[PDB]
């Protein structure tokens, strides 16, 4: 009765401290045998080298789950796709630590991928909650033409159609285009002036520059900005009055690992105590049979829910994303991020700090407005 867990972590010191955390998890009184063995490997820049290392080290060591964290370089995407596909070939579940990309939500691509961090598409729920409390009846979405962007747009439309309301129009941006002046010019002649932005950092900076040069950041306009579109170079181009979102300790790898090790330990205990199980294949070479207990492990992970984590209660939906996550509403004042609101799930609680708006106005502006110029 030996259960092994693999880990793909950014730095050696993090690997050692998380192995120590796994050992501490093994110090529980209800655990007897070796239910959590610690194996770690650094993120190799080469994709096929990483796949070979995983196939030769983790799968060969009878891993029940693999933990993959953020790459050491946030500038590069460095997606965990190479290990996710290999794990999904054998139906071996994985627990993404801080992978916020909205590509693994669909399990038809990543069969056995799970993550404890909500994706960028999940911010549509927070946007809907903010709209329901600030009376943003009319909205306009500026979303780039990307799979993450398409998923976010679909989720936003699905949540908005519940109130029998729809956005005026939706514009698509190419992933890397520069001449976005026409889209903003045609979006200016709209009754609604509450803009939600969902794009990349460079695209967000380009949109900010285009709005600044077209005087689109004046009084009355409200800009809703996600987590990705404020971080990085956007701080040097975002105008005042940005209503941005930020994930509480979202990039904190230590807390996510500490929660994930306990969650996976409890899941392993439940799976072992549930019924008869099938051992993982000893070698990754020459075997074309999926794990029989893989779907059962995924089901028990989905059904798992524990509040012992330092980041609040940890639970997974049918799409493998965290439910009831904590968001912090950030308002850009004097080119500095100010925490002005919190989001504990389906509820927005503003703080005592005043909320400024683009154009220098302090009073809360209206949303949809008329121009009395009817074509």
């Amino acid at each position, epitope marked *: 009765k030996i259960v092994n867990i693999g880990a793909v972590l950014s730095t050696r010191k993090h690997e050692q401290m998380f192995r*120590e955390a796994v050992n*501490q998890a093994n*110090k529980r*009184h209800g*655990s007897w045998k070796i239910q959590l063995n610690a194996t770690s490997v650094t993120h190799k820049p080469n994709a096929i080298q990483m796949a070979l290392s995983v196939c030769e080290d983790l799968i060969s060591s009878q891993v029940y789950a693999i933990l993959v964290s953020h790459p050491p370089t946030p500038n590069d995407h460095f997606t965990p796709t190479p290990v996710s596909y290999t794990a999904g070939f054998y139906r071996i579940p994985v627990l993404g630590l801080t992978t916020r990309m909205s590509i693994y939500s669909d399990k038809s691509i990543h069969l056995s991928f799970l993550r404890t961090v909500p994706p960028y598409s999940h911010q549509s729920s927070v946007w809907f909650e903010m709209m329901r409390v600030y009376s943003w009846n009319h909205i306009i979405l500026l979303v780039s033409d990307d799979h993450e962007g398409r998923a976010a747009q679909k989720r936003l439309e699905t949540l908005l159609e519940e109130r029998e309301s729809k956005a005026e129009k939706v514009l698509q941006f190419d992933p890397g285009t520069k001449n976005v002046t026409a889209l903003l010019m045609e979006a200016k002649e709209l009754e609604a002036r509450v803009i939600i932005l969902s794009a990349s950092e460079d695209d967000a900076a380009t949109v900010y520059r285009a709005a600044a040069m077209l005087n689109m950041t004046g009084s009355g306009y409200v800009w809703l900005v996600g987590e990705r579109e404020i971080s990085g170079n956007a701080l040097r181009y975002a105008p005042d009055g940005i209503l941005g979102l930020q994930l509480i300790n979202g990039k904190n790898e230590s807390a996510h690992i500490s929660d994930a090790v306990g969650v996976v330990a409890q899941a392993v205990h439940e799976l072992l105590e549930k019924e008869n199980i099938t051992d993982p294949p000893r070698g990754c070479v020459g075997n074309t049979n999926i794990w029989k207990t893989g779907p059962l492990f995924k089901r028990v992970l989905m059904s798992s829910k524990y509040a012992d984590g330092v980041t609040g209660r940890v639970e997974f939906n049918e799409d493998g994303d965290r439910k009831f996550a904590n968001y912090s509403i950030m308002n850009l004042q004097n080119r500095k991020l100010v925490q002005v609101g919190i989001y504990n799930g389906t509820h927005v609680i503003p703080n005592d700090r005043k909320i400024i708006w683009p154009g220098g106005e302090t009073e809360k502006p209206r949303g949809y407005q008329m121009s009395t110029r009817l074509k």
Partner: antibody, heavy 121, light 106 residues
Framework: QVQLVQSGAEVRKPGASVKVSCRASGYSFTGYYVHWVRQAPGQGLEWLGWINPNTGGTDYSQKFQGRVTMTRDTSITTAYVELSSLISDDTAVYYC??????????????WGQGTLVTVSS | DIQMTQSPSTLSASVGDRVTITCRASQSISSWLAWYQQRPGQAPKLLIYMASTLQTGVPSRFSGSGSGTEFTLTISSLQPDDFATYYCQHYKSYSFGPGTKVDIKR
């Protein structure tokens, strides 16, 4: 020198809350577990739980769940345990012991002098 | 979990007499058992860890044997300071037995 200092004897009415401290010196406080074991008179040792100062993880016995709270402070290397809903059977002596981190072959190498808690009307 | 049973409940012997304590667990625990000595009004002291190796500073008279579910504590010569209660505890259950107390025969 490895030494453990606890609080003095306290008497509390039933249904109240009692807090017991445990100060460690002479070794890495974060690098060793702190375990709380009680012993009623005329009865053997009874285990309550343990706290890891390095990560703050708290483990509690299923019998004592919902009443035992353990906190640690790295700045002063002191551990505190809080117990609520005291009953007549809770009158015992509480001891804090040291356990090695990662190694599972050194059970309670050192023991403190113990703190006596009396529950009566 | 795992329940620890100690036998005999009470043992009385003269000074220098051999002392044998038998402790049994509910199921197999391999060799993860430890023996403690606790005098009345005093904190417990660890004598043998892992039931095979003696703790540093413990007199050589104490010895441990057994494996699996049955473990035996053996004292070659009883001493006046050895009149205390002995407990057997498993590592990953933190469960202590009822305790065997050595008293002067009378």
């Amino acid at each position: 020198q490895v030494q453990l200092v606890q609080s003095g004897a306290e008497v509390r009415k039933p249904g109240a809350s009692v807090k017991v401290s445990c100060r460690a010196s002479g070794y890495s406080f974060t690098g060793y577990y702190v375990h709380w074991v009680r012993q009623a008179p005329g009865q053997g040792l009874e285990w309550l739980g343990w706290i890891n100062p390095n990560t703050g993880g708290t483990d509690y016995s299923q019998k004592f769940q919902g009443r035992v709270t353990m906190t640690r402070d790295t700045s002063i290397t002191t551990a505190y345990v809080e117990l609520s809903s005291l009953i007549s059977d809770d009158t015992a002596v509480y001891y804090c012991a040291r356990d090695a981190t990662g190694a599972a072959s050194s059970p309670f190498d050192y023991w403190g002098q113990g703190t006596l808690v009396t529950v009566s009307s | 979990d795992i329940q620890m049973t100690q036998s005999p409940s009470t043992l009385s012997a003269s000074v220098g007499d051999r002392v044998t304590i038998t402790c049994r667990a509910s199921q197999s625990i391999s060799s993860w058992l430890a023996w403690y000595q606790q005098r009345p009004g005093q904190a417990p002291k660890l004598l043998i860890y892992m039931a095979s190796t003696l703790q540093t500073g413990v007199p050589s008279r104490f010895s441990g044997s057994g494996s699996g579910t049955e473990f035996t504590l053996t004292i070659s010569s009883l001493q006046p300071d050895d009149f205390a209660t002995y407990y057997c505890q498993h590592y990953k259950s933190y469960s202590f037995g009822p305790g065997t107390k050595v008293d002067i025969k009378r």
